[PDB]
Every structure is written in C-alpha cells, then in structure tokens.
C-alpha cells in the first residue's frame, strides 16, 4: 500500500490483499507437506517439516505469516538478502 498518509496506506494494503489470496496446503493442519528450499531473486528460504510441539522457529516475519496461514510447527532459515518483500 502506497499513500501520503500512513493510515491511507494501511487501508489500501489490507483491502487489496484480501483479493490476492493464496490457498496453502497444510499437512494435518499444522505443518508443511515436505521440506521446501527455494530462491526468490537473491533471498534464500529453507523450510523444514516438523512434528507437533516443535513450534515456529523462523524469521519473525515468517512467524507472523505462518500464524495467519495456520502453520504451527516449522523450521525456516533465511539467507542472502533479507529483503522483506522478497
């Protein structure tokens, strides 16, 4: 969201995000189905499937997003550029 005022940017961002929704598959509704290792531009993300009770041991931004998706147990490591948007 972009605007001169911060509250206007907040409005634009959250109202627009609800029209660009993904659906994320979850194994047993608590973790991912398999280890995920990818690169987006210069940002590397490595995610590991974990058992119940492991918790979210990830970059704080990944923790925030995982709570919104519904993932409870996962390990993630971010390498390279730590660009938030990437």
């Amino acid at each position: 969201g972009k605007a001169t005022d911060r509250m206007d940017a907040f409005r634009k961002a959250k109202n627009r995000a609800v029209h660009h929704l993904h659906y994320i598959e979850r194994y047993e509704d608590h973790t991912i189905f398999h280890d995920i290792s990818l690169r987006f531009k210069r940002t590397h993300i490595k995610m590991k499937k974990q058992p119940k009770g492991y918790g979210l041991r990830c970059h704080r931004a990944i923790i925030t997003i995982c709570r919104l998706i519904g993932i409870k147990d996962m390990y993630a490591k971010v390498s390279g550029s730590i660009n938030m948007l990437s």
């Binding site: 590991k48 499937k49 974990q50 058992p51 119940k52 009770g53 492991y54």
Partner: protein, 295 residues
C-alpha cells in the same frame, strides 16, 4: 507319570498367545515422547503387505509373555562367625563382587555384621546392590511410592493397569515378593470390574489368564469373551482349565459327554462355574444373535 503343564509349555503358550490377540493399533500406539519428523515411502500393494507382515512379527516379539515364577525362598546362610570382631564396628559392611562377566544371580554379595558374622546378603539387599553398581534403566534403588496401596488404587481408577504392570516389571524381579503381590492385586482389580480388555494385545494377558485358571476364577473372563463374540477364546479357556484341573467335576463331565466347542462352556457352567446361571444366559444370548445372522 502325568505332569501338569507349566506356563512355558508349547501347548500352553500357543493357547494363551491366541487368547491374547494381536492388535497392531494398540500394540504400536503412538508414544508421548520426543518426536522426529516422519519418513515416507512409495509402496505397491505387495510392498505394503510385506511391511505389514514385518510389523506383525515385531509385535509378536513385543507380546512375548514374561515367565511366571514362584516366589523366591529367603536367603539365610552364614559363611563365618568371627566373634573376635564383636563390638569393633557399629555399622555393617556390604561387599559386592562387581566382576563384569557374571550373571547377577551368581554374584557373591556378603555382609559383615557388627557381631562379626559374615553372611550372604538377602534378596532385597542383593537387588539393591545390583542396581547401585549395574544400574538398569527404569529401576530405582529406593522403592517408588507408586506401589503403595493408596497410590495403586489411583492408577486403577484411571484404568492404567498396564502402566502398573510396566512399572512393576521395571522395578522388581519376577520371582520377588513385591512383584507377585502387585501383579495379583492388579489381576484382582481387573476381575472385580471386568476390565479384561485393557490387557488384550499386551504381554500381560497370558499371566493374568494363568492366575485366574490356577485360582479357579475364570467366570468373569469367560463371560467377557462370550459378550465379545470370542467363543474360540472362550472354548480354549475352558479347555485350558480342564488341562490344569484334570480331576475336576467339569473335566470329567466333558469326558463323559464328549463335549466339544460351545458344549464345553455349558458343561463348565453347570459343574464348577460359580456364576453358572450368568454364563448360560450370556451364552444363550450369543446363540440367538448367531441364529439371526444365519437367518
């Protein structure tokens, strides 16, 4: 001449193994412990049936019945009475031979008393010294308080009888007085409340059956098997009863009448069974439901 079978006889072990049953879901129940991420395999229908076959073999090893031993006789043997040492010490010494390659039941463990006597250690002193120098995982030098009567009733109220038997097996020796006392109190609580299903598919079911048959109290377990459509087990239970009590009213009635199958349960229900009336009724209800399915 004619010896009565023992618990470890091939004929008895085969009967008790079938009566126990094998439920992979219960035998391999998920344990609450530190977890690791699971692994995955792609299998055909044949590979899956083979993997399930190996699981049944691993379960039959986990269901291996512990041997039922008689209570050990107390140890009271003096090696020497050195009276010249009388009154020279106030505390007794316990000497333990810790030579590595020796069976624990062959290790010499002696005690020098303040009176000068050199005697062999008692069974309780032995098992305590063996745990001090050869610590076994799950065993404690001091007897846990869970085995007190007040705390065992709490475990029975929660239907944790198998946990009591797992705790007892890890703490006491099979021929120990504490081991036999706890097992009998657990069997008696199962018989009083009809909780025989708690021990099915476990290595403790055979020991429980062996206890009921020797003490002539199979009426409860027999009723439980008929109510669950386990007549193949209920018939083997009556046969095992006749084998261990050949000169009995029921055993003779089966010979005179040449009873077989369900007929054995009827002969037993009339002669030696204490709850004979409740067995005939429970057995009658079974034959009805079996006729409805036939018709």
């Amino acid at each position: 001449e004619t010896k009565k079978p023992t618990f470890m006889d091939e004929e008895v072990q085969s009967i008790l193994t079938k009566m126990t049953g094998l439920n992979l879901q219960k035998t391999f129940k998920p344990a609450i412990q530190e977890l690791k991420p699971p692994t995955y395999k792609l299998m055909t229908q044949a590979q899956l049936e083979e993997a399930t076959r190996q699981a049944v073999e691993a379960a039959k090893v986990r269901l291996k019945m512990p041997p039922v031993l008689e209570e050990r006789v107390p140890i009271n043997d003096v090696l020497a009475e050195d009276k010249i040492l009388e009154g020279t010490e106030t505390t007794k010494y316990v000497f333990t031979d810790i030579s590595y390659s020796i069976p624990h039941r062959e290790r010499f463990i002696v005690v020098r008393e303040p009176s000068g006597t050199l005697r062999k250690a008692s069974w309780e002193e032995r098992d305590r010294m063996i745990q001090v120098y050869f610590p076994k995982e799950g065993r404690k030098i001091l007897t846990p308080i869970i085995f007190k009567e007040e705390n065992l009733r709490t475990m029975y109220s929660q239907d944790r009888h198998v946990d009591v038997l797992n705790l007892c097996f890890a703490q006491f020796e099979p021929d120990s007085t504490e081991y036999i006392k706890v097992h009998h109190k657990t069997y008696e609580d199962i018989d009083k409340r009809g909780k025989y299903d708690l021990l099915r598919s476990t290595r403790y079911f055979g020991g429980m059956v062996w206890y009921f048959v020797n003490n002539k109290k199979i009426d409860g377990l027999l009723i439980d098997q008929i109510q669950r459509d386990l007549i193949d087990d209920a018939t083997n239970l009556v046969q095992l009863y006749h084998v261990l009590h050949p000169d009995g009213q029921s055993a003779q009635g089966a010979k005179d009448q040449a009873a077989e199958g369900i007929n054995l349960i009827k002969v037993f229900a009339k002669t030696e069974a204490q709850k004979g009336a409740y067995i005939e009724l429970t057995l009658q209800t079974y034959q009805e439901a079996l006729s409805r399915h036939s018709a």
